[PDB]
C-alpha cells in the first residue's frame, strides 16, 4: 500500500460504502428493483478491496477489521436475502447498523493537528468532566421537577364525554370538539356545561397507548414529560391540560418556573461549557486601453451592481396572476435572458482585459463566473424555473460588495473559513450517519413511514435536530415497535436529541463567538500599543435623599414620585378590557388623571429648572426625554379627548395603542434600566448588519420560492379530488377532535365531521404567490415553529425535490443565521463589561481574584480531646464515608415521592411511614454533630442551618401526621421531602458550583428580566386594545386570548417560547368575510388587524427571542466561569484553597482571622500538598514570602485574605496573567522584597518561582 492514490480511493470507497448501506432498504428495492442488485454489486467490490487492504498491511486498525467483518456479514445477509430465504422485511437488516460508521475513515486523516495529541486529550478530559458535571446538574433538576409534577398533578384521564356513555364503548363520537380535559371537583379545574359529563377515560377500558405517553402518573413518566417540556416543545398545551384538570396556580407556578430555570439557564450552562472549551483550546494552542481603463471605472462597477439589483427585483416581481396568465417564453423570461447576456458579456470582457489567468485568480470572480455558467444554462427553456434558478437568485450576493462595512463584518463574523467549514462538514456527516443508523434500525418496522427510505430518515433526524415536533417522531417510532423495545428506542432518541441540542447547536454559537473575538496575539499587541422663581424649581427638582440609604438616594424625590405614579397607572391599566373601558369606567380614570397632572407638574418643575434645549442637563436632551414628552403628550391628548367611540383601525385606536407605551418610563426613571438599554444598544450596528444578512438570505429564498412555488400550493380541500375541474360541490370533512389521543376507529363507526363546500385554496398560514407572502412565510420558518407543515406541503403539492429548498434555508437561517444574533449579543455584552480585550489567562486571573475574594476561612471548630464521647462522635461525623452515606440517604428519601401521596390511595401509608424512619435517622445525624461540634460550632455553618431547619420541620410533620393523619399532613411531608432533597446540592462540589452559577445569574439578571417584563406589559396592553375581541380561530381559544391583561401577558410569555406564535398571529389577522365588522366601535366587532397583527407579533418575537433572551445567556457564560473551576497547573485549585483553609485552621487555633507575622512562617512550613515550600531545597522562596507577609504591614499581623493573595500571586506567571498596571506593580513589589532580603543577608509555587528566578 505504498501507493498514495490507494488512500484517496479508500476514502472515496468509504463514502461509497455509507452511500450503499443508506440505499440497502426494503422499500427502496420495492420501488427500484435493479438497485437491490447494484448494492450487492458495490459491497462485493468494496469488501474485496478492503479485505485485500488489511491482509496487505498484515502480510486503529481494529476498527478496520471490525468494519470489514461487518461488510462481509452484510454481504452474506444480502446473498441470502436475494435467495428469498430471508424476508426483506425481517429484523436481520439490523446486521448493517455499524456499516455507516465506515464514514469515519473518510475524515480520519484530517485529525492531524499542529500540536501533540496530549494537548487534545487534556482538552477533552477537561471538557468531558465539565459536561458530566452539568449533566448531573440537569439530572438533578429533572428529578426535582419530576417529583414536583407527580405530587402536584395526576393522570390527565378525566375528559368530558356525552351524558349517556358507558364503559367499553368510548369512541371518537364521545369526546368534545376539540377534546377537553376537566375536573371531577366543583370549583377546581374546568367544568364542562350540561349535556356532558366528566369521566375517567382510563376507567372506560382504554389503553395508555390510546391516551398517550406524557403525564405525571409515576416518576419515570413525569421525568420524561419534564425533559420534553424543557425543550419548549408542546409545553403550553400540557399546561392547558393541567389548568383544566387541576387548580391554575399550580400549573402556572410549575410550568413558568420550569421554563425559566430548565429551558433557559440550565440549558445555557452547556453553551457556557462549550465556550470555555473553545477558550481552553485557544489557551493550550497559545502555550507554545479604450476598454481596459473603462472596466476599472467606478461608474461601471456601480452600473453592474445596479443591473444586478434590477435583475433580482424583476425576477422576484413575477407574482401569481392566475391559471390564465403565464408562459415559458414570458416577458420575465426575456428580461432574464437579457440580463444573463449582459452579465456574460461583463465576465467575458473582464477575462479579455485581465486574462483568464488573472481573472480566475480572484475568489469573487470565481463566484461571478460560476454564476455566469449557472445562469447561461438556466435561460435554457428546459432548465428555466428549475433547480438552476438558485444560481440566478445568488446574483444578489454581488450587492454585498456595495458596503465595505458589511463586507468586513461578514469576513469577521465568519472568520477563518476552516473553523465553521469543518463544523458544517461534521454536522452533515453526523446527520448522514445517524440517519443511516436509524434507517437500518427501523427500515423494516411495519406501519412506520418515517424511516422507510434514506430521505425520510434524514428528514426525521433533521426534524429532531430542529426540535420542532421531535416528540411526535419519537412517539410514532415507539408505537411502531413493540412495547418490549420501546424503552431502548426512547433512550436512543433521547440521547440523540441531547447530543444534538446541547452540543452541536452550542458548538455553532461557540464557533461564531470565537470568530467574533480577537486572537491572543492581536489582543496582547494592542494592549501593548496603548501602554427669581427658577430657584424654587431648581431646589424642588435637585432635592433627593448601609444600602437602604443608598436605595432611597437612588433618584430624586420627584423621580420617586414619578416612579410610583407610573406603577400605579400601570396597575390601573391592567384592569382595562374591551368591555371595561377607561373612557366609560370612572374608577379607571382616576390614575389616568393623576399620571397626567402630576407628570405635567414634573415636566414644568424640570423645564423651569433646566430649560429644554441647549443646556448641559436639559429635559429633552436624550432620546429618553423625547420618549418622556411623547408619552406625556399622548396621555394628555387622550385624557382631554376621551373618545366614547373608537372605530377599529382608526386614529383613536392608534392613540390608545400608543398610550400603552407608559411602562417605558421606568426605563428612563431607574438608572439600572437606563444602563441595560445603553449596554444593549451599544451593539446596534452589529445587530443591524446581522439583520441585513438575514434579510438578504430571506430575499434570495423568497425570490426562488415565488418563481417556483407561485400558485402551485393551492389544492382541493377534499383529499379524494385531484384536479381543479372536479373541485366543486360538497363533501364530508372530518373535524379535528384530538391530536393527543390515538383512539382507533371501529369498522362500524364514522368519524365526526360535517358537510362543507369543495374549494381550491392555499394554506391559510403561508403561500408563495407574492414576494411579501414568501418573505413572511420564510420569516415564520426562521423561528422553527410550524416549519414541518411548510416542509410537508411543499414536498406534497410541489414535489419531493423541492424538499431541498426548505432544508437548506432552515440550515443557513436557523443553525447559522440566528446563531449570529447570539454571538453578537454576547460579544457586545463582554465588550461593555470590559473583558473582550483581555486574554484568556487574564480572564481566568480575574475569575480567580473574585473567587478568592468571596472565599472565607473554614470556620469549623477543632477536634476536641478532653472527652472521648465528643471526640469519638466527631471522628465519626467528619469521616467522608459518613458524609457520602448521608448524601445517599437524602437522595433515597426523595424516591418516596415517586408516587402521589394520596389519602384515597393505600400505597401512601407505607411510603409515608418509611419517610418517618428516614426523618428520625436524619435527626440522629444532626444530633450527633450537635454533640461533635457543640451548638456554637454547629450553628457556624450556614448549611447546617438549613439541615436543622428541614429536620425540625420533619419532626413537626411526624408528630402532626401520627397525631392527625390527613391530606394536609401528607402535603407537608411531601414538602419536607422536597426540601431535604434540594439540600443535596450542598453535599456535592460541582453541583454546588453549578447551582451557585444559576442562582447568581438569576440575581444579576434581575434588571434584564424586569425590562423584558416591561416590554411584555406594553405589548400586553397594546394587544388587549388591538385583538381584545378577535374571533376564536386556530390557536386563539379559551386559553389563548387578549380579552384581559393577564390573558395577554400569559399568551405573550407563551409566544416568547415560540409555541405556535405564527398561528396566533394569523388568527389575529382575520378579516371579512371571516368576521363581522363594525363601523362604530372596536369592541363591537370580532375582526382583527392585519398589518397591526403583523407588526405586533413580528416585532415582539424579534425583540424578545432573537435579542433580549440572549442577554441571559451571556450572563450565564459569565458567572459560570466565575464559579466553576477545575484543577489547573497555573492557578489555585478548589483543592488548593480547601487545603489552605485546613492548614490555616490548623496553624491558627484562634478564630480572629488574623495571624501574627511570626506565625506566618509556621503556616508556610506547615503548608503541604500542591503548595509546599520546601525549606531544604527552596529557602529563597520561603524567605521572600515571609518577608512579604512581614512588610505588607509595619509589623501588623496579616489577614487570611492577605496570605491567600500572596499565594495566588506566587502560583501563576504574572507576566501572562496580570495586566500592565498590576503586572508592573507586582513585579516592582516582588523585586523590592527580593533585593531587600538580599541586602539584609549581611509544585505550582515552586515551579513558578523557578520560572521567575531563572528568567531573571
Amino acid at each position: 500500500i505504498n501507493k498514495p492514490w490507494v488512500h484517496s480511493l479508500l476514502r472515496i470507497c468509504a463514502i461509497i460504502s455509507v452511500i450503499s448501506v443508506c440505499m440497502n432498504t426494503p422499500m427502496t428495492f420495492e420501488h427500484y428493483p435493479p438497485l437491490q442488485y447494484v448494492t450487492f454489486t458495490l459491497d462485493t467490490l468494496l469488501m474485496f478491496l478492503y479485505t485485500a487492504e488489511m491482509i496487505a498491511k498484515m502480510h486503529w486498525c481494529v476498527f478496520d477489521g471490525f468494519m470489514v467483518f461487518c461488510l462481509w456479514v452484510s454481504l452474506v445477509l444480502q446473498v441470502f436475502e436475494i435467495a428469498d430465504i430471508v424476508d426483506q422485511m425481517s429484523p436481520w437488516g439490523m446486521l448493517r447498523i455499524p456499516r455507516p460508521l465506515i464514514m469515519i475513515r473518510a475524515f480520519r486523516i484530517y485529525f492531524r493537528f499542529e500540536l501533540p495529541r496530549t494537548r487534545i486529550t487534556n482538552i477533552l478530559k477537561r471538557s468531558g468532566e465539565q459536561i458530566w458535571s452539568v449533566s448531573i446538574f440537569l439530572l438533578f433538576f429533572l428529578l426535582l421537577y419530576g417529583i414536583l409534577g407527580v405530587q402536584m398533578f395526576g393522570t390527565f384521564t378525566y375528559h368530558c364525554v356525552v351524558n349517556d356513555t358507558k364503559p367499553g364503548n368510548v369512541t371518537w363520537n364521545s369526546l368534545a370538539i376539540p377534546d377537553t380535559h376537566c375536573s371531577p371537583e366543583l370549583e377546581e379545574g374546568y367544568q364542562c356545561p350540561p349535556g356532558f359529563k366528566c369521566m375517567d377515560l382510563e376507567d372506560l377500558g382504554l389503553s395508555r397507548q390510546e391516551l398517550g405517553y406524557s403525564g405525571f402518573n409515576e416518576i419515570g413518566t413525569s421525568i420524561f414529560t419534564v425533559y420534553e417540556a424543557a425543550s419548549q416543545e408542546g409545553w403550553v398545551f400540557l399546561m392547558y391540560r393541567a389548568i383544566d384538570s387541576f387548580p391554575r396556580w399550580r400549573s402556572y407556578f410549575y410550568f413558568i418556573t420550569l421554563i425559566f430555570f430548565l429551558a433557559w439557564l440550565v440549558k445555557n450552562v452547556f453553551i457556557a461549557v462549550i465556550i470555555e472549551t473553545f477558550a481552553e483550546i485557544r489557551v493550550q494552542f497559545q502555550q507554545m486601453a479604450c476598454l481596459q481603463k473603462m472596466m476599472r471605472s467606478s461608474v461601471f462597477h456601480m452600473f453592474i451592481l445596479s443591473m444586478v439589483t434590477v435583475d433580482v427585483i424583476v425576477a422576484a416581481s413575477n407574482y401569481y396572476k392566475g391559471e390564465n396568465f403565464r408562459r415559458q417564453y414570458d416577458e420575465f423570461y426575456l428580461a432574464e435572458v437579457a440580463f444573463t447576456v449582459l452579465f456574460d458579456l461583463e465576465a467575458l470582457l473582464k477575462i479579455w482585459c485581465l486574462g483568464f489567468t488573472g481573472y480566475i485568480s480572484s475568489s469573487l470572480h470565481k463566484f461571478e463566473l460560476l454564476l455566469v455558467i449557472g445562469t447561461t444554462l438556466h435561460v435554457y427553456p428546459d432548465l428555466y424555473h428549475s433547480q438552476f434558478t438558485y444560481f440566478q437568485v445568488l446574483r444578489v450576493v454581488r450587492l454585498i460588495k456595495i458596503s465595505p462595512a458589511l463586507e468586513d463584518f461578514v469576513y469577521k463574523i465568519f472568520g477563518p473559513g476552516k473553523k465553521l467549514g469543518s463544523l458544517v462538514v461534521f454536522t452533515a456527516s453526523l446527520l448522514i450517519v445517524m440517519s443511516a443508523i436509524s434507517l437500518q434500525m427501523f427500515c423494516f418496522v411495519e406501519e412506520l413511514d418515517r424511516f422507510t427510505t434514506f430521505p425520510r430518515a434524514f428528514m426525521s433526524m433533521f426534524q429532531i435536530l430542529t426540535q420542532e415536533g421531535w416528540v411526535d417522531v419519537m412517539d410514532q417510532t415507539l408505537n411502531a415497535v413493540g412495547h418490549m423495545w420501546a424503552p431502548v428506542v426512547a433512550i436512543y432518541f433521547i440521547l440523540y436529541h441531547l447530543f444534538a441540542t446541547l452540543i452541536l447547536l452550542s458548538l455553532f454559537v461557540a464557533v461564531i463567538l470565537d470568530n467574533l473575538e480577537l486572537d491572543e496575539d492581536l489582543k496582547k499587541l494592542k494592549q501593548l500599543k496603548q501602554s427669581r422663581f427658577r430657584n424654587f424649581c431648581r431646589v424642588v427638582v435637585r432635592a433627593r435623599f448601609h444600602q437602604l440609604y443608598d436605595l432611597l438616594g437612588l433618584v430624586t424625590y420627584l423621580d420617586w414620585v414619578m416612579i410610583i405614579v407610573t406603577i400605579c397607572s400601570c396597575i390601573s391599566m391592567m384592569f382595562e378590557s374591551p368591555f371595561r373601558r377607561v373612557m366609560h369606567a370612572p374608577t379607571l380614570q382616576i390614575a389616568e388623571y393623576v399620571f397626567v397632572i402630576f407628570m405635567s407638574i414634573e415636566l414644568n418643575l424640570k423645564i423651569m429648572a433646566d430649560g429644554l434645549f441647549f443646556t448641559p442637563t436639559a429635559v429633552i436632551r436624550d432620546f429618553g426625554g423625547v420618549m418622556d414628552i411623547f408619552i406625556y403628550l399622548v396621555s394628555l391628548i387622550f385624557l382631554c379627548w376621551m373618545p366614547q367611540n373608537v372605530p377599529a383601525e382608526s386614529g383613536a385606536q392608534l392613540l390608545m395603542v400608543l398610550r400603552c407605551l407608559r411602562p417605558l418610563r421606568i426605563f428612563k426613571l431607574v438608572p439600572q434600566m437606563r444602563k441595560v438599554v445603553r449596554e444593549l444598544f451599544s451593539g446596534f450596528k452589529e445587530i443591524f448588519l446581522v439583520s441585513i444578512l438575514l434579510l438578504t438570505l430571506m430575499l434570495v429564498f423568497a425570490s426562488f420560492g415565488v418563481q417556483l412555488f407561485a400558485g402551485k400550493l393551492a389544492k382541493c380541500n377534499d383529499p379524494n379530488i385531484i384536479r381543479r375541474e372536479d373541485c366543486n360541490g360538497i363533501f364530508r370533512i372530518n373535524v379535528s377532535v384530538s391530536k393527543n389521543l390515538n383512539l382507533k376507529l371501529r369498522p362500524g363507526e364514522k368519524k365526526p365531521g360535517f358537510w362543507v363546500p369543495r374549494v381550491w385554496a392555499n394554506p391559510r398560514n403561508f403561500n408563495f404567490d407574492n414576494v411579501g407572502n414568501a418573505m413572511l412565510a420564510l420569516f415564520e420558518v426562521l423561528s422553527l415553529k410550524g416549519w414541518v407543515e411548510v416542509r410537508d406541503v411543499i414536498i406534497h403539492r410541489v414535489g419531493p425535490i423541492h424538499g431541498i429548498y426548505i432544508h437548506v434555508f432552515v440550515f443557513l437561517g436557523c443553525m447559522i443565521g440566528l446563531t449570529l444574533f447570539v454571538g453578537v449579543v454576547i460579544a457586545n455584552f463582554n465588550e461593555n463589561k470590559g473583558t473582550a480585550l483581555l486574554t484568556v489567562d487574564q480572564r481566568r486571573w480575574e475569575d480567580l481574584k473574585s473567587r478568592l475574594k468571596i472565599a472565607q476561612p473554614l470556620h469549623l471548630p477543632p477536634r476536641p480531646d478532653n472527652d472521648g464521647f465528643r471526640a469519638k462522635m466527631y471522628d465519626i461525623t467528619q469521616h467522608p464515608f459518613f458524609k457520602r452515606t448521608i448524601a445517599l440517604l437524602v437522595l433515597a428519601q426523595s424516591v418516596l415521592l415517586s408516587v402521589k401521596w394520596d389519602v384515597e390511595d393505600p400505597v401512601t401509608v407505607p411510603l409515608a411511614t418509611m419517610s418517618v424512619v428516614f426523618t428520625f435517622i436524619f435527626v440522629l445525624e444532626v444530633t450527633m454533630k450537635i454533640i461533635a461540634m457543640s451548638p456554637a460550632g454547629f450553628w457556624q455553618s450556614r448549611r447546617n442551618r438549613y439541615d436543622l431547619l428541614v429536620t425540625s420541620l420533619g419532626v413537626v410533620w411526624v408528630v402532626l401526621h401520627f397525631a392527625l393523619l390527613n391530606a394536609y399532613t401528607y402535603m407537608m411531608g411531601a414538602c419536607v421531602i422536597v426540601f431535604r432533597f434540594f439540600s443535596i446540592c450542598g453535599k456535592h462540589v460541582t453541583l454546588k458550583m453549578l447551582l451557585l452559577t444559576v442562582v447568581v445569574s438569576m440575581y444579576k439578571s434581575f434588571f434584564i428580566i424586569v425590562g423584558m417584563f416591561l416590554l411584555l406589559l406594553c405589548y400586553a396592553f397594546a394587544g388587549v386594545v388591538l385583538f381584545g375581541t378577535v374571533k376564536y380561530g386556530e390557536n386563539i381559544n379559551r386559553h389563548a386570548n387578549f380579552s384581559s391583561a393577564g390573558k395577554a401577558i400569559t399568551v405573550l410569555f407563551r409566544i416568547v417560547t415560540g409555541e405556535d406564535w405564527n398561528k396566533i398571529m394569523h388568527d389575529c389577522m382575520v378579516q371579512p368575510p371571516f368576521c363581522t365588522p363594525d363601523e362604530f366601535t372596536y369592541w363591537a366587532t370580532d375582526c382583527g388587524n392585519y398589518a397591526g397583527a403583523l407588526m405586533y407579533f413580528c416585532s415582539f418575537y424579534v425583540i424578545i427571542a432573537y435579542i433580549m433572551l440572549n442577554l441571559l445567556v451571556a450572563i450565564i457564560v459569565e458567572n459560570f466561569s466565575l464559579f466553576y473551576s477545575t484543577e489547573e497547573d497555573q492557578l489555585l485549585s478548589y483543592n488548593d484553597l480547601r487545603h489552605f483553609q485546613i492548614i490555616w485552621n490548623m496553624v491558627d487555633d484562634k478564630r480572629e482571622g488574623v495571624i501574627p507575622t511570626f506565625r506566618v512562617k509556621f503556616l508556610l512550613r506547615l503548608l503541604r500538598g500542591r503548595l509546599e515550600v520546601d525549606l531544604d531545597k527552596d529557602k529563597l522562596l520561603f524567605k521572600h514570602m515571609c518577608y512579604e507577609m512581614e512588610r505588607l504591614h509595619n509589623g501588623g499581623d496579616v489577614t487570611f485574605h492577605d496570605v491567600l493573595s500572596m499565594l495566588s500571586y506566587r502560583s501563576v506567571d504574572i507576566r501572562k496573567s496580570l495586566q500592565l498596571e498590576e503586572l508592573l506593580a507586582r513585579e516592582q513589589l516582588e523585586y523590592t522584597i527580593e533585593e531587600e532580603v538580599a541586602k539584609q543577608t549581611i509544585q505550582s509555587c515552586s515551579i513558578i518561582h523557578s520560572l521567575r528566578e531563572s528568567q531573571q
Binding site: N173, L175, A176, I177, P178, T180, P193, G195, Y320, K321, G711, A714, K715, N717, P719, C727, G729, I730, R732, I733, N734, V735, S736, V737, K739, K751, P752, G753, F754, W755, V756, P757, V759, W760, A761, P763, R764, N765, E789, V790, D792, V793, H796, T1029, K1031, Y1032, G1033, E1034, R1038, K1063, P1072, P1073, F1074, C1075, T1076, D1078, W1083, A1084, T1085, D1086
Partner: protein
Amino acid sequence: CYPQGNLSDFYLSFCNSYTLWELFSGLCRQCVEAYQDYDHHAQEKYEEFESVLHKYLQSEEYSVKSCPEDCKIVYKAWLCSQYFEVTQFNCRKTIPCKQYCLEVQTRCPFILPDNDEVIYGGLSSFICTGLYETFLEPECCDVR
C-alpha cells in the same frame, strides 16, 4: 302555508324556505317524491352538522357578534340552497344565495379539520372562495 307530507302554498318539510312552485319553476309523484327525498338528505346532513356543533364547548365565546343560533340558521340556508339550486320569487327580502356561504364562515365558529390525509395549514373546515376566484345569479330569501 301547507307543508307537504296553487303550488305556491306547499312548502317542504325541512327546507321550509322553498315551495313546490319554486321547484317546478326552476329544478306529480315523479318529481314531488324526489324533492322530498332531497329534503330528507338535507335533513340528515344538517343533523350531522348539529351533532358536530353541539360538541363545540366554546359555543358562547367564539365570537361577540355571532351565536350558534345564527350559525345554524345560515348553515341550513346554505345547505338547502346547495340541494335546491333554484330561484325564489315570493321572497320579500332578496339575497344572492351564494352570499349564504360567506355568512356561514362569518357567523359559524372556526372548526379545525383533521390533518391525517392532508395538511390544511390553518384552513377552516368551511370555506367559500378558492385561489383567486370571483365568488359573485340565483336569488333566495333572507331568513337571517
